[PDB]
Amino acid sequence: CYSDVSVHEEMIADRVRTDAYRLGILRNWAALRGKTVLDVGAGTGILSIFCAQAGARRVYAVEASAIWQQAREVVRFNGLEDRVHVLPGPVETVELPEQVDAIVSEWMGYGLLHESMLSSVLHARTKWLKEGGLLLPASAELFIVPISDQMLEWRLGFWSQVKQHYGVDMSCLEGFATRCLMGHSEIVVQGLSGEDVLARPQRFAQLELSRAGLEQELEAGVGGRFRCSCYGSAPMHGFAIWFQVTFPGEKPLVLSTSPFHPATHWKQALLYLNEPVQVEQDTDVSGEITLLPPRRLRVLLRYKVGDQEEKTKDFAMED
Numbered sequence: 036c037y038s039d040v041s042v043h044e045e046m047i048a049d050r051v052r053t054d055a056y057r058l059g060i061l062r063n064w065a066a067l068r069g070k071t072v073l074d075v076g077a078g079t080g081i082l083s084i085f086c087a088q089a090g091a092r093r094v095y096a097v098e099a100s101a102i103w104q105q106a107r108e109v110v111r112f113n114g115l116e117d118r119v120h121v122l123p124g125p126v127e128t129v130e131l132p133e134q135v136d137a138i139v140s141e142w143m144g145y146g147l148l149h150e151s152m153l154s155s156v157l158h159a160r161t162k163w164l165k166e167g168g169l170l171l172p173a174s175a176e177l178f179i180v181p182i183s184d185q186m187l188e189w190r191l192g193f194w195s196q197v198k199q200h201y202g203v204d205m206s207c208l209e210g211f212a213t214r215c216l217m218g219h220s221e222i223v224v225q226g227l228s229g230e231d232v233l234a235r236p237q238r239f240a241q242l243e244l245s246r247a248g249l250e251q252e253l254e255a256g257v258g259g260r261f262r263c264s265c266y267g268s269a270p271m272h273g274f275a276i277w278f279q280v281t282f283p284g285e286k287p288l289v290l291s292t293s294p295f296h297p298a299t300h301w302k303q304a305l306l307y308l309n310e311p312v313q314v315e316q317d318t319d320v321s322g323e324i325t326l327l328p329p330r331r332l333r334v335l336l337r338y339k340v341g342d343q344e345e346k347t348k349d350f351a352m353e354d
């Protein structure tokens with residue numbers, strides 16, 4: 036259980052994630068006080084306990100993986116076993132004695148595990164949430180922007196620096212490094228900063244989690260067109276995608292994974308072009324992006340940089 040503890044350690048050590056959930060939940064104290072909550076995928080149980088601190092009478096903490104033992108332990112240890120009930124197994128088959136006033140979950144991320152988690156939360160909403168019940172978070176939004184990855188630039192430049200240190204010219208391996216690091220069709224999860232961002236980020240989709248038939252909409256695919264204009268001269272390496280989610284308040288609380296906001300464990304998802312393309316101030320960058328489900332979540336991208344012809348590059352997540 037090494038990667039098992041590391042995953043839960045990583046989440047809890049993310050103060051942006053954890054304070055956002057804590058405040059997001061607490062700020063609904065008036066709607067939660069004395070009410071019932073389902074925590075879908077409770078993990079170590081911290082979100083369920085946040086709900087109790089907000090005043091919930093009963094929280095059902097449903098967890099499919101072995102970490103539920105630790106959740107049971109943490110709740111019992113905090114003396115909340117009367118108010119938080121840890122239930123092992125998948126949410127799709129759990130039996131609650133009542134329908135709930137609110138659902139909390141932390142389903143977001145990049146890959147098949149997270150897609151499966153949203154589906155499970157939507158299954159639970161339809162099955163167990165009362166009409167007009169609270170969803171925490173309630174919505175998500177997806178953003179895209181052209182980027183220049185400084186770390187990648189260094190790695191691509193590395194082979195040209197070997198001569199200076201060891202008297203052997205390996206500059207000829209730039210082509211090789213580029214093909215290997217950029218020519219694949221995988222999504223790369225990497226943390227960027229604001230200076231990597233080459234234009235204004237564009238929202239390309241919104242997911243309102245209360246909508247019935249969202250499961251159906253997701254299966255078709257989520258996304259849309261985008262357009263933007265670059266800020267200055269740079270080697271454009273591709274696009275970054277990220278999300279935010281919103282907790283209703285009475286101003287809503289936003290948990291964001293943007294490169295301009297504090298770093299989170301989610302980082303951003305990078306879509307590299309096959310090789311770098313030079314952009315300038317006012318270079319138009321436009322395209323269409325679609326995220327959809329051999330069991331793979333495909334990212335379909337068609338884009339145009341400047342006067343270049345439109346190009347397709349499709350990526351995938353097999354997990």
Ligand SMILES: Cc1ccc2c(c1)[C@@H](c1ccc(F)cc1)N(C(=O)c1ccc(Br)o1)CC(=O)N2
Pocket residue numbers: 142143144145146147149150153175176177222242253254256257276278279280304326327328332334
């Ligand atoms: C079609 C679909 C279905 C479920 C679904 C996704 C996409 C998205 C998603 C992630 C976060 C959100 F706030 C919203 C959506 N997910 C992705 O992997 C993803 C996003 C960008 C790239 Br690149 O990949 C998995 C997920 O958490 N949920």
Ligand SMILES: Nc1ncnc2c1ncn2[C@@H]1O[C@H](CSCC[C@H](N)C(=O)O)[C@@H](O)[C@H]1O
Pocket residue numbers: 046075076077078079080081082097098099100102124125126127140141151152155
């Ligand atoms: N169908 C399902 N039913 C119940 N739990 C699930 C599930 N699919 C995944 N999970 C669990 O959901 C968790 C997501 S990790 C989030 C953990 C916790 N809510 C926290 O915020 O700290 C994992 O621990 C995983 O085992």
